[PDB]
Ligand binder design. Sequence first.
Ligand code: NAP
Ligand code: NAP
Lengths: 487, 486
Amino acid sequence: QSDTHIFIIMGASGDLAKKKIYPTIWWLFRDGLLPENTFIVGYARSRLTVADIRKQSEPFFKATPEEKLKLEDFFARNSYVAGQYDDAASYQRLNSHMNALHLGSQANRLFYLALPPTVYEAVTKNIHESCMSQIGWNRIIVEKPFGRDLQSSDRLSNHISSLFREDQIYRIDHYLGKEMVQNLMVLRFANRIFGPIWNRDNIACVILTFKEPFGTEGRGGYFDEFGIIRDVMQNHLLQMLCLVAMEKPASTNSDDVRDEKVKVLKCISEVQANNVVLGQYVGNPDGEGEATKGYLDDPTVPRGSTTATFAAVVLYVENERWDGVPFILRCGKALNERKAEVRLQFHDVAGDIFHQQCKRNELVIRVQPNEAVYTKMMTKKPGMFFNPEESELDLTYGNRYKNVKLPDAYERLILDVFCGSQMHFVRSDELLEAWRIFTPLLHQIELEKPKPIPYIYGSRGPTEADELMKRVGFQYEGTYKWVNPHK
Amino acid sequence: QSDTHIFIIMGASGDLAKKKIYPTIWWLFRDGLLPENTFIVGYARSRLTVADIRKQSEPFFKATPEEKLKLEDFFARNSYVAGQYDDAASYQRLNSHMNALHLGSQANRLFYLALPPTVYEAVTKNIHESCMSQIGWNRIIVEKPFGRDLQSSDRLSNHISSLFREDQIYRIDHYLGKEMVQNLMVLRFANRIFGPIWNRDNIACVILTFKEPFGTEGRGGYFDEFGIIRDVMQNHLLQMLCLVAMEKPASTNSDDVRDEKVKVLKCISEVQANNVVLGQYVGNPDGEGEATKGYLDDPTVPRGSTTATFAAVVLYVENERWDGVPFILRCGKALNERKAEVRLQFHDVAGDIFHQQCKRNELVIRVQPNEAVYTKMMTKKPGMFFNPEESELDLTYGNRYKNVKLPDAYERLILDVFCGSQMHFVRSDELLEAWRIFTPLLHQIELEKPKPIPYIYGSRGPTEADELMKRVGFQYEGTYKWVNPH
Ligand SMILES: NC(=O)c1ccc[n+]([C@@H]2O[C@H](COP(=O)([O-])OP(=O)(O)OC[C@H]3O[C@@H](n4cnc5c(N)ncnc54)[C@H](OP(=O)(O)O)[C@@H]3O)[C@@H](O)[C@H]2O)c1
Ligand SMILES: NC(=O)c1ccc[n+]([C@@H]2O[C@H](COP(=O)([O-])OP(=O)(O)OC[C@H]3O[C@@H](n4cnc5c(N)ncnc54)[C@H](OP(=O)(O)O)[C@@H]3O)[C@@H](O)[C@H]2O)c1
C-alpha cells in the first residue's frame, strides 16, 4: 500500500555509495518505482550535510535539466547522520533521527551495507541493538557476503544469523540482477523447445564465461588479496551455473527457487587441481597505455605475487540430469574483450547422414554487452548447394527492443528488497556450499603458491585453458562465420 | 560429366517453354552448371528457326549486355525440329537430327515434356520407339497434372511405366525445388535442437499453408476442372507434409528418402468430410480491379460452378511418432497475401510456474516470400518486469545472406535431372497414395456438389476454417507482436 519506508545507506561517503547506491536509488525515485513515502538516510564517519553528499554524488546521477523539480524533491527526502561504526551512542542518534521522520517508528527499514566488510560484524551488532523498527519490517543488504576463507566467512555468517532471520538478510550477487541472467529461468521453464533437450543425453558441455579487457588499472593491491576465483568465479559464474543446472522449482517463490539452486550445489564435488588452469597477465609491449603494464608492474601489488588474474575450472554436477557433463567456468582480466556469457554445446546427432559435415549445435545466452540469445545450428547452405552449413537463429535485444531501457542490476535488486523478494539474493546454505566447493583448491593455492601461466594483455589467456576445454569434451572448429544482419 | 548431353524441349513454342524452360536452361548454362558438351533441341508443331525461338524467349532471359558472349555460345548450341506429336515420321526426323549432333548416337538424352497432358500418352509412345539412345541414358521430365482421380492417374502411370523404368521418369512437383523446402531435411536431421522435440509428445499440431492474393485472373476455366485440392493440396502441401513427418532415412540417396515419404502416406487414412472446409471467393465491392470480381464473375468459368478456391483439410498420420497430431492443410486463392509456410505448434509446458502467462512455442519455416526460419518462444519481458512475453529466435535469409542468389526451383530441378538425382521428384507409389487419400472425398464432392462457403477477395478465407483448426487443437491468441529488426 502506502506505508513509510526508510532507506539507510551505511557508508554514505564511501565510493560504492557515491557512485552506485545514491544514483541507483535516485533512478528508482525518478521513475516512480519507490513507495511514495520514502526517506533516504546516509550514515558515515565524516561530519557532512546533505548539500555535501549531493555535490559529491550528483555527478553520477546523469540528471537532465528537465529533472530539476524531481531532483529537489529527492534531496528534500534525504538526510545524513554522522557516527562511528562501533559506537553505541552514534547508532542511538541514528535511531532517534529515524523515529523523528514522518511515521518513523512505524516505517519499514532497509539498511544498505556499503562499507568495508571488515566492519560488518560491528555494524550488524549495533543495528540489531539500537535501530530496528518495532512495527515495520527490517532488512539488511550485505554487499560482500563472502569473506576471505571458509572460517572467517562462516563466523561472520553465524554472527549475522544469530541476530537476523534469513528473511531479513539480502546477500548481494549483482549478476542476479542482470537482464539475461534473470531470463535464464524463463528461457528454460516457459518453453518446450528447450525442455527435452536440457540434459546429459543432449548436452556435451556447458561453458560459463567472464571476460574483461582491462587489467587492475592501478588498484591491484585490493585485488591481490582475493584473486580471480574469489572475485568472479565462486560468486558470479557459480550462480549462473545454478540457474542453468537447477531442476524446475515448485513455483517462482523465492525459497522454492533457492532450494533448487542449493540442491545443484550439493551435488558438486570439490574441485580437483587437475581440472584447473591459472594465469597472470603480463604487459603487451606492442600495445598502448595501461596495456603495456603487467599485473606485477602495478606498484600497489606485492613484488613476486603469484595471484591469478585468469582461471579456467571444470566442475561436475553428479545427478541424473547432468552426470558426466562438464561445466567449464572460464574468467579473466586483461583479455581481448568484455563479455559475460552462457554457452551450451549439444552432442553430435546420432545416425549421421550428412558425411561428417555437421557441427554441434550451441545455445548462447550473452549477458553483456549487447544482450542477446542465439542458437547456432545447421541449415542447407543457401543457393545451389546440397550441403549443410552453420548458421543461427537469433534474438538481439538492441535491435528487437530498440526503445526499452534495461535497468542496471542494482536498480532491480534494490527494488526487489523494497518488494520483499529474496529470489535474486544468496541464501546462507548457497554460500556454505560455494565455500565447500572451492575451499580445498584455494587452500592448496595459498599453501603451494603455484606459479600461474603468463598471458599477454589483450589476448584470450593461456592456451592451456583451451586444451583443458578440449580434453573434457568441448569442440571448437573455428569454421562458423557470422556477418551482422542489422548493420 | 564429360559425356555429351542433349536437352530436348518438347513443346518448344508453347508458353511453359518460352517463359520458364528456355530461360532456366540458359541460367544453368551461363552459371557453368551444365555439362560442357550440352546441346538444346526444341521440338513443336510450328515451322520455326532458332532465331524465332530466341526472339520469342530472350525477353525472359534477363540477360545483361555483359553476357553477350555466353549468349551467343548458348544459341550456337541450340536447334529446332518441326513435327506433330503423333506422327512416326516427325520423330524419325528428330532422332536423325540428334544422331547428327556431336556424338549424338552416344549422348545422354533428356526430354522435357512442356506440352498439354492430353498428349502425354502419344509423346511417350513415340519417344520410346524412335528416339532413345542405345548407348546413353534416357530420361523424361513430366510436368503435372497426373490424372484427376485414382483411376485416370493410375492408367496414365501404367502407360508410362509399361514403356519407361522408374529411374527414367522424373515427375515434377516444383515445390521440391524451392530453397526452404529442401532445407526441411537438413533442419530436421542435422540438428539436435530439433530432434527430440519432433514428435507427438511435444507437437500439438502442424500447419501447412499455401496462400495467393490473386484469383483466377481470367483463366478460371482451366482451374475449374481441378479445384484447389487437386491444384495445390494433393501435390505441394502433401509433399511438405511428407518432409515434415518422415522418419530419418537410411541415407540421402533418392530412394531411401522417397521410401520414407511413401511410408508416411501409407499411414494416412482417407480424408473424411467432417474434417474439410471449402470456400469460393466472391468479389470485394470496396476493392479495385480484379479484386471486385468473384470466381463466378470470370466468364470462362461455367455458370453455377461450386468448385472450391479455398480448402482446409485435417489429416492424421497413424504411426508411433505422430498418432493423434493433426496436420492441417490450408490453401486458397484470392486471399490477403502470398505465402507458403510450415508451422509446428508445440504443446504447453507441463507444470506451469508462470500463472498461465505462457503461450505455446512455434517453429515456422517460411518457404516464400522472404525465406526465413524462426522459433516463437517466451522470454522475460525486457526491462523492469518479471513476467514472460512472446518473442522469437530468427533467421531471415534476406538479411543474413544479403549477397546470395537463391535459384528458381526449376534451375535446381533440371540440374538434378542432368545429375541423375530423383530425390526431388515424385515416385509412382507416392502418387498412388496421394490418390488413395483424396479420391473418396473428391468423388463425394463431385456427387453431392456441396456449395462452398463464400469469402471476400483479399480476406483470410472462411472463418469456419479457423474454427476447424481450433477444434482439432490449434491455439491462436493474437497477442504476439513482432517489430522488424531492419
Ligand atoms: N546476436 C549476435 O550478436 C551474434 C549472433 C551470432 C554470432 N555473433 C558473433 O559471431 C562471433 C562468433 O560467435 P561465437 O563466439 O558464438 O562462435 P565461435 O566463434 O565458434 O566461438 C565459440 C567459443 O569458442 C571459443 N574459442 C575460440 N577459439 C578457441 C580455441 N582455439 N580453442 C577453444 N575454444 C575457442 C570462444 O572463446 P572466447 O569466448 O574466449 O572468444 C567461444 O567461447 C562472435 O563474435 C559473436 O559475438 C553474434
Ligand atoms: N523473419 C521474419 O520475417 C519474421 C519473424 C517473426 C515474425 N514475423 C512476422 O510477424 C507476424 C506474426 O507472425 P506469425 O504469423 O508467425 O504469428 P501469428 O500472427 O500469431 O500467426 C499465427 C497463425 O495464426 C493464424 N491466424 C490469424 N488469425 C487467426 C484466427 N483468428 N484464428 C485462427 N488462426 C489465426 C495465422 O494465419 P495466416 O497464416 O492465415 O495469417 C497464422 O497461421 C507475421 O507478419 C510475420 O511475418 C516475421
